[PDB]
Assembly symmetry: C6
Homo-oligomer: 218 residues x 6
Amino acid sequence: EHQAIAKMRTMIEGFDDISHGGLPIGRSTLVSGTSGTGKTLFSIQFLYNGIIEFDEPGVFVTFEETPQDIIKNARSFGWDLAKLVDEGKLFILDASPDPDLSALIERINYAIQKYRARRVSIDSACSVVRRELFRLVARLKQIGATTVMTTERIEEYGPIARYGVEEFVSDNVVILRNVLEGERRRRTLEILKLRGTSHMKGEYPFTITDHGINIFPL
Amino acid sequence: AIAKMRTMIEGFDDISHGGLPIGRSTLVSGTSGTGKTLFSIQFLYNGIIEFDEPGVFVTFEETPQDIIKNARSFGWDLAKLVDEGKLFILDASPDLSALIERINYAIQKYRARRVSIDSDACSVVRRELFRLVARLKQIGATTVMTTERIEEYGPIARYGVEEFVSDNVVILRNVLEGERRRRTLEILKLRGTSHMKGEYPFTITDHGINIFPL
Amino acid sequence: HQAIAKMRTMIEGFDDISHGGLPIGRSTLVSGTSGTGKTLFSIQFLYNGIIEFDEPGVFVTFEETPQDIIKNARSFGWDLAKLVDEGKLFILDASPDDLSALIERINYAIQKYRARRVSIDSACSVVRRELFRLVARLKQIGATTVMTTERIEEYGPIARYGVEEFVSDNVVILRNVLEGERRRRTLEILKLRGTSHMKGEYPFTITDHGINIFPLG
Amino acid sequence: SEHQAIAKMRTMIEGFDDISHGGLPIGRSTLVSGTSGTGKTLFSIQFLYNGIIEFDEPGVFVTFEETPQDIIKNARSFGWDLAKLVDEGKLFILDASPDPLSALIERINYAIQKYRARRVSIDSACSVVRRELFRLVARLKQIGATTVMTTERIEEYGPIARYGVEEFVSDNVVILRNVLEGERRRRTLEILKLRGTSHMKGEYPFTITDHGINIFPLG
Amino acid sequence: HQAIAKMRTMIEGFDDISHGGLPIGRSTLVSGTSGTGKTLFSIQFLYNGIIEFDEPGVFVTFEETPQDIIKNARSFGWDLAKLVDEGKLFILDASPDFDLSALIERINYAIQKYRARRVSIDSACSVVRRELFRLVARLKQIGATTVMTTERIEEYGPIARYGVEEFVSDNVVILRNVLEGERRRRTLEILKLRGTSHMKGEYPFTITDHGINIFPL
Amino acid sequence: SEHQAIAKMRTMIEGFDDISHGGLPIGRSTLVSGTSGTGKTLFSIQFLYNGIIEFDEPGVFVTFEETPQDIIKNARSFGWDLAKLVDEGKLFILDASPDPEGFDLSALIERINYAIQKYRARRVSIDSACSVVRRELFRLVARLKQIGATTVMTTERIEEYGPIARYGVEEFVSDNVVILRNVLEGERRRRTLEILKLRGTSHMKGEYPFTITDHGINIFPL
Ligand SMILES: Nc1ncnc2c1ncn2[C@@H]1O[C@H](COP(=O)(O)OP(=O)(O)OP(O)(O)=S)[C@@H](O)[C@H]1O
Ligand SMILES: Nc1ncnc2c1ncn2[C@@H]1O[C@H](COP(=O)(O)OP(=O)(O)OP(O)(O)=S)[C@@H](O)[C@H]1O
Ligand SMILES: Nc1ncnc2c1ncn2[C@@H]1O[C@H](COP(=O)(O)OP(=O)(O)OP(O)(O)=S)[C@@H](O)[C@H]1O
Ligand SMILES: Nc1ncnc2c1ncn2[C@@H]1O[C@H](COP(=O)(O)OP(=O)(O)OP(O)(O)=S)[C@@H](O)[C@H]1O
Ligand SMILES: Nc1ncnc2c1ncn2[C@@H]1O[C@H](COP(=O)(O)OP(=O)(O)OP(O)(O)=S)[C@@H](O)[C@H]1O
Ligand SMILES: Nc1ncnc2c1ncn2[C@@H]1O[C@H](COP(=O)(O)OP(=O)(O)OP(O)(O)=S)[C@@H](O)[C@H]1O
Ligand SMILES: [Cl-]
Ligand SMILES: [Cl-]
Ligand SMILES: [Cl-]
Ligand SMILES: [Cl-]
Ligand SMILES: [Cl-]
Ligand SMILES: [Cl-]
Ligand SMILES: [Mg+2]
Ligand SMILES: [Mg+2]
Ligand SMILES: [Mg+2]
Ligand SMILES: [Mg+2]
Ligand SMILES: [Mg+2]
Ligand SMILES: [Mg+2]
């Protein structure tokens, strides 16, 4: 009678151990952090590994970084996203305003079905934020997408995200930190919450190298 | 003394000196992922399973289907209890007066003794919260109400008034010590009765909340 | 033509800390975070007034029902129901559906029951003036009054709006401080205009006989 | 020839005239700021009372909250009979407290002329607070009164007063503190600034007793 | 293709900790409290580009006059008026006596005029974030490699002033001037470089007669 | 001449010319910021007084709250006879203080300019919405520079180790920044002076202790 909720493996080294199997399938995981913490990298590695390891197609939704820079930056880690877009295994949805929510979603829906995507990454007034963020989560759940949603925060040990509500609306919450002490920076990942399932607790150190994120349950 | 109802949440009835005061409202406040919803659910589930006391769960964001799914993680089959008419999940998710009349109706219909209510001006909140607590008191329900807070050692709840309108106040914390998280539960206040003081560690496992007093 | 006199609370240790009790004919502000003992102090004040001196009391509640006030005092062995049945205690229910209307009601009750002790439980610019009015009008009636107020930090503002301590003649702070994982309650008399008192924090506990304070003296 | 540029009048408050190197600058206003129950009213009353008793200098006490009756009653704590001084026309308590600014200044002026007062105690947005306070100070100076002005603050170490402008407009600033440390309170007085002369600096301990304020200047 | 390439600053110590210099074709935010060396860094970027690589530079100023930028550069033995006269450098005076699109076309007009490869820009949140993004995107489409300075008011607080600048920039450098025990210590940090690697944390530096010197310590 | 790095004018304030390696940058404004009673007015008077006495460089003092009479009176604390200097036409105190019973900075700047011309002054002291503050200070600084004045500008702050001035913009619009502190350490006060920045030239770093004496500011060696 003890039924566990299903998880999808990220294959990001060390993360699937911390999360006891990966990300809860069919739900959204908030990945929050200050600048340069690895939010986009995590969200890319999620889709890249799904395609390469499991032939699970992905939709990356971007709101500021252009598709070409995303693909360009992913070359830092030896990943050819251009090739995956050419094969129709990756779709980069450009939702970044040229130099509204209902429309964005059916766009994502259309892209999910067109590419048969199972994995989605979305990168990146409190009252309106909470309620508009809930319905975004709500709709993705109905599609059956497993989704990484990045958010920004401005303090390493302050609120989880910018408006103090995002962490309460999300099913799952991951926090990327880049803590400065004694003039040195230390990267850590923490799974704060996974509704309805177990996970390791606290911060785990990680590095970003030529092969992406490396977490040490170490 | 004052009559209490057993939560049967491991360790909690020892800390509260016998359980939660019957007919009164208990605030359960914590940061994200502290175990608020779990405490709420466990409170109703145990009431039903061990004492045949029916319950009403009121949810303002989480869907009933997710509540049920997330609870099967603990081997608790809530759909069964709903089917047997012993649990009712009130979906107020995605008008305070109408809500209260809806809660009231659900209590009468299912004959509930236990209620869990899960999750802007400073004293519209106080006024409206006081209203809700006041009416549940008249009905005679014993209520667990959860609230969010954003800091482990800061205000009790979001608006700085919630703990003053509640009869009882429980704080769930999830504190960083170095790079590790330690969960604790504290009964800050129980009106009209004694209780253990300060913080007590707990874990969440496959069997729910497990608190270690003494 | 002499320094203000005091009325004994008979709350163990408090009359030592205050050097004789609460200043007569004035209000004393009693401030604290949730569950610090504010209502208890303000009940014990009235209860001891009745039991020890046959001084009738009026309790003004704004949220807690009279029945709850009574039920909650049973854990101390205080039979408030009987005191209310005897006409010695009047619990004024001021829980809402203009404090000018409240004042006359209080005055009304104060005169029928011949009360000498009162407890009131419980825009910054407006707060200050409204509190000032209340203190002043209670002073005119001649009532010795405890009024509780809320605060949200143990070692921060005296009260909520940062003005209450400045309008009040007398100020008591109840604290409930974390020491390790344990809690420590303390009572402090911050100020009493026109008279002397002990300084700093004194530990207390809440027991089956109410507030129990320890000055080492 | 005491080699300091600003003439001072003695408060005769024990230890304060040492710390201030002679007392309060004559014809100027001194801000006295403190948290609740720090002694601000006591200091401003003791200033007037001593002026009267020691030098027969009449004094005006302006109160915005406490009633005259309570001011008088509370001074009895220190053995001071202010009603007697009011009856003798040596003390005037100006009641500006609210019923249970340009015109207030004229009342003050009228009282000062009527009672020949030498000492004044006034007891007790930022854009307009500054200019109104500046106005009040300047007018008392024009009259030639020597003024104690009390203000509130909410932290022992933090803003001098409430609006972050009071200490910049005043010529002199005194801070009363009531510091809680290790569950014990200790009172101190500091003269932060006195334009035009030296003064002792830092915090000095004091007590409030049956004789009023007692300050201990050390060195 | 392959990873983003870098442009050498020739600022001693910087090209080592950035592993090659500034990412080409992109903007780098250089944030710092007052007198941290922000203008000096953005000047040295252009100056070295001109002197070492004959890469012309455009310096955009919003407050300091060109005359003062030139005067202050004499502190380091650099003759900016000569470089301006030769057509190697252009100091674009956008200082008042804001339309961002007009400013952008002036920058574009200068870059085409002087064939510049390097640009230094010195110096609600919804508004700020949007405009900065447009400025950054435009410089990217032009091909400029850009240093943009910003102000911050705390050494270990927000990266810039509006809480958004560090999130729309591709690259972020933080200059600090930390006061500890009555002494100041200058440090430089590369916080992030999108799509490429760099050393982490604070590195001490000094400003002397020959500009910025960063020490790998 | 102007092919050279910026030149400095000596303050002759004890120790200050050492810390600043020559004095205040000529032709520019220096912000002098501090909490209450830190010695801002004293620094800005001593700057002018020394200019007149040591170099026969006339000074203009612009006061926005303290009356000229009080400024002169209080300066006697330091042995300085400012009335004598006013009388000889070497010092001019411009009273910009408000009547005891919006502000036009353009008009005031023009009144400052005439005084500078009339008294042929080389040294000026000015005592004492963020966007509006920034723009207005910018125009004042810019105009003084055009006039060629070397200027001390005082500002208030409310924390010893918090913001440099009140509005978080003053220290960015100013060419030079000096911070006067009055730090409470264990019930004692310690006065320190720091030159935070001087655009275009070098200076010593961090805090230097000073005292105010019957001869004014006295900054102790490092
Ligand atoms: N089977 C399990 N074993 C161990 N831990 C579990 C298990 N199931 C859930 N948890 C933990 O319980 C947490 C969820 O507790 P909740 O009661 O949903 O918290 P919450 O305080 O209500 O959070 P919100 O409403 O999302 S802010 C998860 O983050 C896990 O840490
Ligand atoms: N018999 C008892 N023995 C020990 N402690 C008791 C007993 N009865 C009550 N208490 C304690 O007293 C507290 C209630 O104190 P109150 O005076 O009601 O506090 P309060 O400061 O008025 O809080 P509010 O109004 O709810 S914010 C409870 O939280 C218990 O800790
Ligand atoms: N005889 C006395 N012996 C010792 N202390 C006394 C005596 N009389 C009064 N006090 C003390 O003096 C304090 C009153 O000081 P005040 O001058 O009224 O303070 P205040 O700073 O004006 O405070 P406000 O106006 O109420 S915020 C009381 O709180 C007592 O601590
Ligand atoms: N002869 C002296 N010897 C020692 N200290 C003195 C002497 N004369 C004045 N002072 C000190 O100088 C201080 C005043 O310095 P100012 O220059 O007026 O300060 P300020 O920073 O301008 O303060 P404001 O404008 O009133 S906020 C006084 O508070 C005294 O501490
Ligand atoms: N090959 C590499 N080796 C080491 N670190 C690298 C490499 N490539 C990129 N990085 C690091 O990855 C960081 C960028 O990670 P991102 O995922 O872009 O961060 P981000 O959290 O999304 O930041 P934003 O969107 O700009 S706020 C850079 O700042 C580098 O520190
Ligand atoms: N020859 C030099 N030797 C040493 N330090 C110097 C020299 N010339 C200038 N400096 C220093 O350089 C600092 C100025 O650096 P800038 O680049 O102008 O700083 P900034 O961060 O742009 O400051 P702003 O724009 O005024 S907030 C001065 O405050 C001096 O400390
Ligand atoms: Cl790393
Ligand atoms: Cl756990
Ligand atoms: Cl206790
Ligand atoms: Cl004392
Ligand atoms: Cl340096
Ligand atoms: Cl000194
Ligand atoms: Mg990113
Ligand atoms: Mg929950
Ligand atoms: Mg209470
Ligand atoms: Mg007072
Ligand atoms: Mg600059
Ligand atoms: Mg001054």
